[model samples]
Target: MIQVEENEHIQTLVYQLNKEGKSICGDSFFMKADDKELICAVADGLGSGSLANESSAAIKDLVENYASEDVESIIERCNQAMKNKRGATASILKINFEQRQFTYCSVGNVRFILHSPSGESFYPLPISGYLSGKPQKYKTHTATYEKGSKFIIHTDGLNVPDIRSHLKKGQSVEEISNSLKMYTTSRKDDLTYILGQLS
Candidate 1:
């Protein structure tokens, strides 16, 4: 588990590995404070290997460089960076804990799951279009975060269908996280995930 500490406001934990026979764990995370806003991002590249690593790294850097920017702008910059490279499936979530709000914009198949005391919800960011020189466009989603909510983000390599049923039945974060190892096929491919809980 990777823990992030910034000021006295928020904390983040990240876990990533190249399990399932993939080349590299193309996952990255960043947390920053912009005046009254607290921003966080998790990016997973398309495939494994050095190229995938570079793609995920570039996405994280782009988001970090413009932490103060709006969600749409950051997504555009990330998509542009991927287009310049071999390209990657990227998902980003920006949270403003101070305002109890969050925004998400993604390109590709990264999965974002939200769990509240009420229930769990799923958001799948899908990308479609022929491979081209120009960056692919993406749709954006935004929501107001409740005081006691939990969020998790994972790459497709983590085996979604096998865990979906279990996750929906009020499973704990630790249980869902541990179950990844049981369902994942590529012990070497990028197996990256992020879990967040509000106190």
Candidate 2:
């Protein structure tokens, strides 16, 4: 809920913590890439520790390394890439600023949400199963976003807080990302959340 500077362009805030006793987080996110569209995502590996890490990392790696504009294609590719691995669930967001289009896609329990200052919210619920093993199905949600819009993507590690009050503070996406990570985190599983704002 703390105040922070705003950016004219959209940016991201991310936090990840591994489950207690685990050497590595089975969850991960990918947001760094040079592309016309903004692509970012979070993945939670099945179970915990290295096994889950392997699954989540594979999913994140495939998206970061080979994802295209077509979210479905990327997911299908991830499915193939994760075959025989431990399995994982994930959420991804792609924003095309020039086109004013925003797409949210996911599989398993990873969640994607778009919230407006006016209090309305949109959720692109995750598909039913994780990646790896058999082929999987996914859901894709799209919309146009204006400035002041907020997108929150995360694994099921934290119970999302009531962010309506915080949105009034003018905190940048990066600032909110920290609170969302520290405050809401359950510390019960591999936790991660990404906060994004439209310019």
Candidate 3:
């Protein structure tokens, strides 16, 4: 079995509204174990109320069901499911402790951050042209996860200015979250994030 320090755990927070002044939570996160700790989140059904919630929830469930599979296969499964459902934007990241590597697969505008003791870097997952009503394939990216790396994932509802700058400055997760709330417009859709810190 792979060993993980106790303090090296996942931290998550969800706000069931949007900054764009809308109703319903269009964001969700799934944390599970399938040989390793699998972390996934989705910001779905971007238009409005109940339907949006359903879309996000569906995406979350889709990830939960396929969390054990390879990143490419899991994203293919997601595309199939989205085609069958209302279709929401999503971002998924998997960290393999045993291999000391990270895999990322995304279908929308969610963002991912890698924070290390030395510095931090951001990855912006852009939506595909297929999202504009075409059918296209998605590619996955993998990288080595070094010691002291902290993975941060967030939906677009976050206020970019406040959180992004502070996080880049190596602020604590709690501090970044708090700053996001203060600088963001308001709770319009759903605001959510999942953070993983390697020991």
Candidate 4:
């Protein structure tokens, strides 16, 4: 629904704790470059712990592997990679620096929303599903902004708060990632959030 701008670079910050009985959080992200284009993604495994970790890991791997491909093509490969295992919900974003536009694609409940360097904040309707062991449908959208737009994405493990209010507090990306992890992370599950903007 929204993409990042400026700096022509992407920076991310994250914080996490394992579920009560789990050893590791089953959430991860990818912020890499496919040639000059930037590929960013966040994924939540089917459930929690290592088993869930596998699912999210697969998603991150596929996202990185198909970083240069079209958004739909990337989604297709992610679904194909999930088999005999728990499926994961994920979101993939491609930022083409040369093109100065970014594209978004996602499946599942992970939240994706946009903020204005100008307009009111709001949520973009995701495909309302997740990627899994079978043929899954994915959707993609794109846009360019007039300076000041930002992209914030997080896993279902995260409990989203009023980000606009946080802006007034002038929190850093690292602050929000860590604070949100402490405030929103569930004791029963792992959690993560990524805040992106132009420098």
Evaluated with TM-score, which candidate comes out highest? 2
Model 4 weakest 10-residue run by lDDT? 1-10
Model 3 steric clash pairs:
17-189, 17-190, 18-187, 18-188, 18-189, 19-188, 21-188, 22-188
Residues 65-102, candidate 2, lDDT per residue (tens digit)? 76565777777777786778888887777778777688
Give the per-residue Cα lDDT of candidate 4 at 47.
63
Question: lDDT of all predictions, in order shown?
Answer: 0.63, 0.71, 0.60, 0.67
- Report the C-alpha displacement of residue 72, candidate 1, in angstroms: 1.1
Q: Which candidate, 2 or 4, would have the higher TM-score against the true structure?
A: 2
Least well predicted 10-residue stretch by lDDT in candidate 3:
1-10
lDDT of 3: 0.60
Off by over 4 Å in 1: 4-11, 20-23, 33-36, 120-122, 129-135, 162-176, 179-181, 184-188
TM-score of 1: 0.77
Off by over 4 Å in 3: 1-23, 33-35, 120-122, 129-134, 162-164, 168-172
TM-score against native, each model: 0.77, 0.85, 0.78, 0.81
Per-residue lDDT of 167 in model 4: 38
Ranking according to lDDT, highest score first:
2, 4, 1, 3
Model 4 ranges with Cα > 4 A deviation: 1-8, 33-35, 120-122, 167-171, 178-186
lDDT of 3 at 117: 60
Clashing pairs in 2: none
Model 1, 103-127: lDDT tens digits are: 8877666777766656656555466
